[PDB]
């Protein structure tokens, strides 16, 4: 693991997991937008204007 | 030979049509005999320079 | 400089301008220029150098000069035989080494 | 593949599994015989002798004659002593001759005695040497014989020629002569053998006239000179570059001296004609020679024959040549001639000179896989298919994928650099090829930047600067001297820069100083660097260029006398771009001089105009005058812009900088086109449509005729329509005929010779609408990008639009971290010895063999490590290809704790110590 032949393999490396942990998030974000908030539009308008 | 000296008509193909003989041999000799043309410095040199 | 091949007469020119302000110290440097370029050393150019060591004293210059034309076996000029006499009375460095 | 034989033993444990340390296949041939379970089909290993007797005939096919000589003038001349010896005899021999004399001999201190001469010598044919009269020259024979019987040789007539050829090749000219001529005095008479262990040491040095003297010499003394002779007189003209001569004194020796040529004769020739260049026929001439020694003459090839043509045949790049060099080296390998250092040399520089890497790293991998070791001129000439393939890139099809050049340049520059930090950590002597290469190197990829990529001007400084830190610098570092290829490189850098003074004063200090004469090479970039420079007189040196290579011996070629007309039909429009600048210059100096002096303001106001009327003659009568035209027109704001703009001297104050008018750069032209208050809608070239790129409109263009027609029109008859009457010359032949050509571009498209096409409105049209809908929600240009969207649905956006490309990262596997992964990509692999190699990836007593590395020695070392069983192997094939489509998958099954524990170990060790 410590060669000089393998810095490209890490940076493509760090860039997938990167773009797994991101995928993930926005995953997750967009649970949580499908899930509770399709109530924001039948939302109370009190909760709304306060 | 090649097969363009045998057609075409440039003059340095004038070379091709006869024998090798040795460079010391066709130009003048020198002071010591035998010697090559590009060794004397007024052959290689231009004379502009 | 940097571009034409130039020859001993080009610097030469360089030479007498230099000399003509009082340079003798900085025309002896012109001479060390001629050689680094490998252009070669001809009788007006010693007769100049060996002027430019009357002024500036340069004595050690002048040796190496002195020995080059005796290897060189160039004609010495007029100017440049009174200036290795004036050097020789100053430092007698030709009555040491046995160079005449 | 360029793989390590470390990394293909490894690559073949990781094929065959834990079997590959078992038995052989014969030998479970041999237990299914044993055990009697052999099917039919198998060939029964029967009997042991009969089959080794038979694969020894099948190997004695190919076995290898032995071609070592054991020459006694080598075994002499390793001897320090006895060449020491024969030194100071020769000297003795040199400086005081001998008395041939009578009694009392022992009058000197020069020949001490150890412990009616003539005519015993005259009857009894004695020599003089051989009779011992108690004489100083009697004691010089004997202290003679002396030290050439400690050598192993017999001083005889046969004895004497081995002294003077070992004499004569470490210099010891006059020696070899004074012990030459003190034999023949002493009566061992002047052999033609001896006068060729004379001519040896001109043949050496090189002196021609000293040869023809001895050539003479031994006319005049009655000896006619046998082939030896002639053999060492076409050397002597080899080594004083006189090639022509050798096939001269050939035919002459055929012709006069009436002797049949040996093999030698026809290995001389072939040296020669593999270095002639005073004709252009030296390759067939060369060809038709080595056919008439094999069929006419019935002499079989050896080593030399084949090693003198392959020379040759590795010069020229076409492939015909390139192919009888490989065809050659194939016959010279099933032959039973071995390949050594000089093959593999041959074929370095065969594949070199079309720009082969791939095939220059395949030879380098197979001639450490035969454990022959690289020396430094297969990597010059490494370095040298790097610059032939930086040469012939094909830049026109990275222009038209918009592709710079410039990390292809890199790659060659970084790798050759790779190469000399190699050679300097070997503790090579450093040669003046390698520093001659990589000097070629950067002043190619000088001149390729120059020409490919003119606007980027900081790599043309990077290179220039690289080029004179190895010019100034790397010369001097291993104290090495410049030589004629070393000042081609440079001058051909200079000529390309057009720097004409210093290319003249290198080439002046290079014939003067230093003595050297200039190459081809040299004189054709001063020929073209005179010719492409628009100056006043360049063909009149040019042309003192060409008379300094006719009378020097220079070959001139007609491709040079072709590509002068060319070079100067081009460079013509630089000839009249320097005059044109003269008389512009001059009309400037002129406009100055009269809007001071005030001309303008006189002959502005129109006097004749305003007297003679435009509706009155000059006699009164009125006159038909044409109506004016519209204003809005163009041609009336053409005028406008004609009269009303500044003038055409007040464009430019100076000129270029080379000889040329200001304007050909584009920031000229737009400043011009300020000044003549014009905004350009082209600033800079990228925004130039090209029609070069065209590929489609062309190939219509060329057969049917122009698809537009109305493209030029004046008044609407210069259009190319088809007719509307119909049948051949009407639009529905015409238009099904560019529909075929259009299906043949897009049947190029479907077989990838040509890139795929966006999507047209046309196209999307006719599509299914859910792709239509697809489409105008994802924003894709290309089916590509669609095909994207539609197979990766976690890429896109909320509102159904494509995200870009960099916002995507596939998945790299462990797989690609393996040792034969891993000399794939490093482009210094086949660079490197195997102890670089296995010093670089484990640095263990695994890969320590304890000198020859070879595959099947690590092979067999890792048979034994099992068997003991310090290495362990897993059971079953490792690296799975080729089987099942699914293979990628089970070899990263089996590689899954390998990898792992690769990478958890030494951190278990970090923890282990207790930091």
Same mark, same amino acid.
């Given at each position: 693991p410590k060669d000089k032949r393998l810095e490209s393999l890490h940076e493509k490396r760090l860039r997938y997991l990167a773009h797994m942990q991101m995928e993930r998030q926005i995953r997750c974000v967009r649970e949580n937008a499908k899930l509770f908030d399709g109530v924001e539009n039948m939302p109370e308008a009190a909760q709304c204007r306060e | 030979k090649v097969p363009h000296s045998l057609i075409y008509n440039i003059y340095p193909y004038l070379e091709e049509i006869r024998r090798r003989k040795g460079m010391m041999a066709m130009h003048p000799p020198g002071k010591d005999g035998l010697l090559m043309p590009d060794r004397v410095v007024d052959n290689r040199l231009p004379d502009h320079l | 400089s940097g571009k034409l091949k130039l020859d001993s007469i080009c610097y030469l020119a360089l030479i007498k301008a230099k000399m003509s302000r009082g340079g003798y110290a900085e025309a002896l440097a012109v001479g060390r220029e001629q050689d680094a370029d490998g252009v070669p050393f001809l009788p007006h150019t010693y007769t100049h150098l060996l002027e430019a060591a009357e002024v500036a004293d340069d004595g050690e210059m002048a040796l190496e000069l002195a020995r080059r034309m005796s290897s060189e076996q160039w004609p010495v000029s007029d100017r440049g035989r009174e200036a290795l006499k004036k050097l020789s009375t100053r430092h007698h460095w030709e009555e040491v080494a046995e160079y005449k | 593949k360029a793989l390590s034989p470390y990394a293909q033993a490894l690559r073949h444990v990781a094929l065959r599994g834990a079997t590959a340390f078992g038995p052989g296949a014969k030998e479970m041939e041999l237990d299914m015989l044993r055990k009697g379970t052999l099917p039919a089909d198998y060939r029964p290993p029967v009997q042991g002798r009969w089959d080794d007797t038979i694969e020894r005939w099948a190997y004695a096919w190919q076995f290898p004659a032995e071609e070592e000589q054991d020459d006694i003038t080598k075994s002499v001349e390793r001897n320090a002593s006895g060449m020491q010896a024969l030194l100071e005899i020769g000297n003795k021999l040199l400086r005081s001759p001998p008395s041939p004399?009578?009694?009392?001999?022992?009058?000197?201190?020069?020949?001490?005695? !150890?412990?009616?001469?003539?005519? +015993?010598?005259?009857?009894?044919?004695?020599?003089?040497?051989?009779? /011992?009269?108690?004489?100083?020259?009697? #004691?010089?024979?004997?202290?003679?014989?002396?030290?050439? =019987?400690? !050598?192993?040789? %017999?001083?005889?007539?046969?004895?004497?020629?081995?002294?003077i050829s070992a004499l004569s090749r470490q210099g010891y000219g006059t020696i070899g002569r004074a012990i030459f001529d003190f034999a023949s005095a002493m009566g061992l008479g002047p052999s033609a053998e001896m006068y060729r262990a004379l001519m040896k040491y001109a043949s050496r040095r090189g002196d021609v006239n000293e040869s023809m003297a001895l050539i003479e010499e031994m006319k005049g003394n009655g000896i006619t000179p046998r082939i030896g002779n002639w053999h060492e007189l076409m050397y002597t003209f080899y080594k004083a570059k006189d090639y022509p001569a050798v096939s001269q004194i050939v035919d002459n020796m055929k012709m006069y001296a009436n002797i049949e040529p040996n093999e030698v004769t026809f290995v001389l020739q072939l040296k020669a004609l593999a270095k002639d260049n005073s004709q252009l026929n030296s390759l067939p001439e060369a060809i038709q020679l080595f056919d008439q020694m094999e069929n006419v003459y019935g002499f079989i090839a050896s080593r030399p024959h084949y090693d003198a043509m392959m020379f040759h045949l590795s010069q020229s790049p076409r492939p015909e040549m390139r192919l009888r060099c490989e065809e050659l080296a194939h016959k010279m390998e099933l032959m039973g001639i071995v390949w050594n250092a000089n093959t593999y040399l041959n074929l370095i520089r065969s594949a070199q000179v079309v720009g082969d890497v791939a095939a220059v790293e395949k030879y380098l991998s197979r001639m450490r896989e035969e454990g022959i070791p690289a020396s430094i001129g297969h990597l010059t000439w490494a370095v040298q298919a790097h610059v032939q393939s930086m040469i012939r890139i094909d830049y026109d099809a990275l222009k038209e994928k918009d592709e710079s050049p410039l990390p292809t340049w890199l790659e060659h520059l970084e790798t050759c650099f790779g190469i000399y930090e190699l050679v300097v950590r070997r503790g090579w002597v450093m040669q003046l090829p390698f520093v001659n290469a990589l000097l070629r190197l950067t002043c190619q990829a000088t001149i390729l930047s120059m020409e490919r990529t003119p606007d980027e001007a900081e790599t043309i400084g990077r290179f220039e600067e690289q080029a004179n830190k190895i010019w100034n610098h790397t010369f001097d570092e291993w104290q090495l001297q410049k030589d004629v290829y070393s000042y081609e490189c440079y001058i051909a850098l200079l000529?390309?820069?057009?720097?004409?003074?210093?290319?003249?004063?290198?080439?002046?200090?290079?014939?003067?100083?230093? /003595?050297?004469?200039?190459?081809?090479?040299?004189?054709?970039?001063?020929?073209?660097?005179?010719?492409?420079?628009?100056?006043?007189?360049?063909?009149?040196?040019?042309?003192?260029?060409? %008379?300094?290579?006719?009378?020097?011996?220079?070959?001139?070629?007609?491709? +040079?006398?072709? &590509?002068?007309?060319?070079?100067? #039909?081009?460079?013509?429009?630089?000839?009249?771009?320097?005059?044109?600048?003269?008389?512009?210059?001059?009309?400037?100096?002129?406009?100055?001089?009269? &809007?001071?002096?005030?001309?303008?303001?006189?002959?502005?106001?129109?006097?004749?105009?305003?007297?003679?009327?435009?509706?009155?003659?000059?006699?009164?009568?009125?006159?038909?005058?044409?109506?004016?035209?519209?204003?809005?027109?163009? +041609?009336?704001?053409? %005028?406008?812009?004609?009269?009303?703009?500044?003038?055409?001297?007040?464009?430019?104050? %100076?000129?270029?900088?080379?000889?040329?008018?200001?304007?050909?750069?584009?920031?000229? &032209?737009? =400043?011009?086109?300020r000044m003549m208050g014009i905004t350009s809608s082209f600033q800079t070239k990228d925004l130039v449509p090209q029609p070069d790129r065209q590929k489609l409109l062309p190939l219509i263009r060329r057969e049917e005729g122009e698809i537009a027609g109305s493209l030029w029109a004046m008044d609407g008859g210069e259009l190319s329509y088809p007719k509307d009457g119909g049948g051949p010359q009407g639009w529905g032949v015409r238009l099904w005929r560019e529909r075929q050509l259009v299906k043949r571009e897009y049947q190029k498209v479907l077989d990838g010779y040509r890139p795929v096409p966006q999507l047209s409105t046309l196209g999307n049209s006719v599509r299914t609408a859910g792709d239509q809908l697809d489409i105008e929600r994802s924003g894709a240009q290309t089916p590509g990008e669609l095909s994207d969207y539609r197979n990766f649905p976690d890429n896109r956006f909320d509102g159904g639009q494509l995200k870009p490309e960099s916002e995507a990262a596939p998945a790299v596997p462990f797989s690609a971290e393996l040792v034969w992964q891993g000399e794939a990509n490093d482009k210094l692999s086949p660079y490197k010895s195997d102890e670089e190699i296995a010093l670089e990836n484990d640095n263990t007593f695994f890969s320590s063999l304890s000198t020859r590395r070879s595959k099947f020695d690590y092979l067999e070392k890792w048979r034994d490590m099992y068997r003991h069983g310090t290495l362990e192997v897993p059971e079953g094939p490792t690296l799975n290809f080729g089987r099942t489509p699914d293979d990628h998958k089970e070899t990263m099954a089996a590689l899954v704790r390998g990898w792992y524990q690769r990478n958890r170990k030494e951190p278990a060790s970090e923890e282990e110590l207790k930091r």
């Amino acid at each position: 693991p410590k060669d000089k032949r393998l810095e490209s393999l890490h940076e493509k490396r760090l860039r997938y997991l990167a773009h797994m942990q991101m995928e993930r998030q926005i995953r997750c974000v967009r649970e949580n937008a499908k899930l509770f908030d399709g109530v924001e539009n039948m939302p109370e308008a009190a909760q709304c204007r306060e | 030979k090649v097969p363009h000296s045998l057609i075409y008509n440039i003059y340095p193909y004038l070379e091709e049509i006869r024998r090798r003989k040795g460079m010391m041999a066709m130009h003048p000799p020198g002071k010591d005999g035998l010697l090559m043309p590009d060794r004397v410095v007024d052959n290689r040199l231009p004379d502009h320079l | 400089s940097g571009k034409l091949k130039l020859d001993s007469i080009c610097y030469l020119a360089l030479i007498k301008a230099k000399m003509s302000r009082g340079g003798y110290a900085e025309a002896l440097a012109v001479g060390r220029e001629q050689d680094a370029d490998g252009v070669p050393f001809l009788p007006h150019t010693y007769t100049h150098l060996l002027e430019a060591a009357e002024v500036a004293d340069d004595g050690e210059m002048a040796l190496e000069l002195a020995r080059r034309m005796s290897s060189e076996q160039w004609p010495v000029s007029d100017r440049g035989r009174e200036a290795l006499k004036k050097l020789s009375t100053r430092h007698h460095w030709e009555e040491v080494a046995e160079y005449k | 593949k360029a793989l390590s034989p470390y990394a293909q033993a490894l690559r073949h444990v990781a094929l065959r599994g834990a079997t590959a340390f078992g038995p052989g296949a014969k030998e479970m041939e041999l237990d299914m015989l044993r055990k009697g379970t052999l099917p039919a089909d198998y060939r029964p290993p029967v009997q042991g002798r009969w089959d080794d007797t038979i694969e020894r005939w099948a190997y004695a096919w190919q076995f290898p004659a032995e071609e070592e000589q054991d020459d006694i003038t080598k075994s002499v001349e390793r001897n320090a002593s006895g060449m020491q010896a024969l030194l100071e005899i020769g000297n003795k021999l040199l400086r005081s001759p001998p008395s041939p004399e009578p009694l009392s001999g022992k009058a000197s201190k020069l020949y001490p005695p !150890v412990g009616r001469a003539e005519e +015993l010598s005259a009857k009894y044919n004695v020599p003089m040497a051989y009779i /011992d009269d108690s004489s100083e020259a009697s #004691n010089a024979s004997k202290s003679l014989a002396l030290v050439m =019987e400690d !050598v192993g040789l %017999e001083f005889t007539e046969d004895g004497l020629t081995v002294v003077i050829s070992a004499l004569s090749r470490q210099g010891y000219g006059t020696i070899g002569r004074a012990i030459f001529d003190f034999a023949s005095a002493m009566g061992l008479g002047p052999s033609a053998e001896m006068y060729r262990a004379l001519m040896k040491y001109a043949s050496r040095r090189g002196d021609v006239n000293e040869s023809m003297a001895l050539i003479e010499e031994m006319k005049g003394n009655g000896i006619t000179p046998r082939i030896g002779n002639w053999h060492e007189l076409m050397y002597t003209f080899y080594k004083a570059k006189d090639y022509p001569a050798v096939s001269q004194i050939v035919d002459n020796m055929k012709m006069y001296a009436n002797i049949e040529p040996n093999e030698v004769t026809f290995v001389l020739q072939l040296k020669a004609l593999a270095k002639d260049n005073s004709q252009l026929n030296s390759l067939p001439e060369a060809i038709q020679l080595f056919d008439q020694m094999e069929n006419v003459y019935g002499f079989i090839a050896s080593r030399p024959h084949y090693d003198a043509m392959m020379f040759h045949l590795s010069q020229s790049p076409r492939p015909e040549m390139r192919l009888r060099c490989e065809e050659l080296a194939h016959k010279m390998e099933l032959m039973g001639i071995v390949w050594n250092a000089n093959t593999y040399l041959n074929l370095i520089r065969s594949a070199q000179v079309v720009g082969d890497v791939a095939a220059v790293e395949k030879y380098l991998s197979r001639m450490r896989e035969e454990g022959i070791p690289a020396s430094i001129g297969h990597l010059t000439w490494a370095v040298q298919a790097h610059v032939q393939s930086m040469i012939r890139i094909d830049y026109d099809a990275l222009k038209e994928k918009d592709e710079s050049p410039l990390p292809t340049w890199l790659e060659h520059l970084e790798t050759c650099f790779g190469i000399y930090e190699l050679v300097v950590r070997r503790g090579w002597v450093m040669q003046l090829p390698f520093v001659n290469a990589l000097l070629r190197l950067t002043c190619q990829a000088t001149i390729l930047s120059m020409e490919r990529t003119p606007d980027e001007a900081e790599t043309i400084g990077r290179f220039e600067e690289q080029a004179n830190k190895i010019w100034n610098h790397t010369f001097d570092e291993w104290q090495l001297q410049k030589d004629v290829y070393s000042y081609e490189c440079y001058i051909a850098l200079l000529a390309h820069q057009q720097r004409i003074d210093e290319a003249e004063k290198l080439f002046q200090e290079m014939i003067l100083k230093k /003595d050297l004469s200039p190459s081809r090479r040299t004189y054709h970039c001063m020929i073209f660097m005179h010719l492409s420079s628009g100056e006043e007189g360049g063909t009149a040196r040019a042309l003192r260029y060409l %008379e300094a290579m006719e009378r020097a011996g220079i070959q001139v070629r007609p491709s +040079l006398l072709k &590509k002068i007309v060319r070079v100067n #039909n081009a460079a013509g429009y630089k000839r009249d771009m320097k005059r044109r600048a003269r008389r512009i210059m001059q009309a400037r100096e002129e406009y100055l001089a009269r &809007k001071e002096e005030g001309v303008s303001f006189g002959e502005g106001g129109k006097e004749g105009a305003s007297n003679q009327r435009a509706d009155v003659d000059a006699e009164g009568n009125s006159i038909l005058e044409p109506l004016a035209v519209s204003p809005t027109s163009t +041609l009336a704001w053409w %005028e406008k812009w004609k009269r009303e703009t500044v003038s055409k001297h007040e464009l430019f104050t %100076e000129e270029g900088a080379d000889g040329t008018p200001k304007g050909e750069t584009f920031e000229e &032209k737009n =400043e011009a086109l300020r000044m003549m208050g014009i905004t350009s809608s082209f600033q800079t070239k990228d925004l130039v449509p090209q029609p070069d790129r065209q590929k489609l409109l062309p190939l219509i263009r060329r057969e049917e005729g122009e698809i537009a027609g109305s493209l030029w029109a004046m008044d609407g008859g210069e259009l190319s329509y088809p007719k509307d009457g119909g049948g051949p010359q009407g639009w529905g032949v015409r238009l099904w005929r560019e529909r075929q050509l259009v299906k043949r571009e897009y049947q190029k498209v479907l077989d990838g010779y040509r890139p795929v096409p966006q999507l047209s409105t046309l196209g999307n049209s006719v599509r299914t609408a859910g792709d239509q809908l697809d489409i105008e929600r994802s924003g894709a240009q290309t089916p590509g990008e669609l095909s994207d969207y539609r197979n990766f649905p976690d890429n896109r956006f909320d509102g159904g639009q494509l995200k870009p490309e960099s916002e995507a990262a596939p998945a790299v596997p462990f797989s690609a971290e393996l040792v034969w992964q891993g000399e794939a990509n490093d482009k210094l692999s086949p660079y490197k010895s195997d102890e670089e190699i296995a010093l670089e990836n484990d640095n263990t007593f695994f890969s320590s063999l304890s000198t020859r590395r070879s595959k099947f020695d690590y092979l067999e070392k890792w048979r034994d490590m099992y068997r003991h069983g310090t290495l362990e192997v897993p059971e079953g094939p490792t690296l799975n290809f080729g089987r099942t489509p699914d293979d990628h998958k089970e070899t990263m099954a089996a590689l899954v704790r390998g990898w792992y524990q690769r990478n958890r170990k030494e951190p278990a060790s970090e923890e282990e110590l207790k930091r």
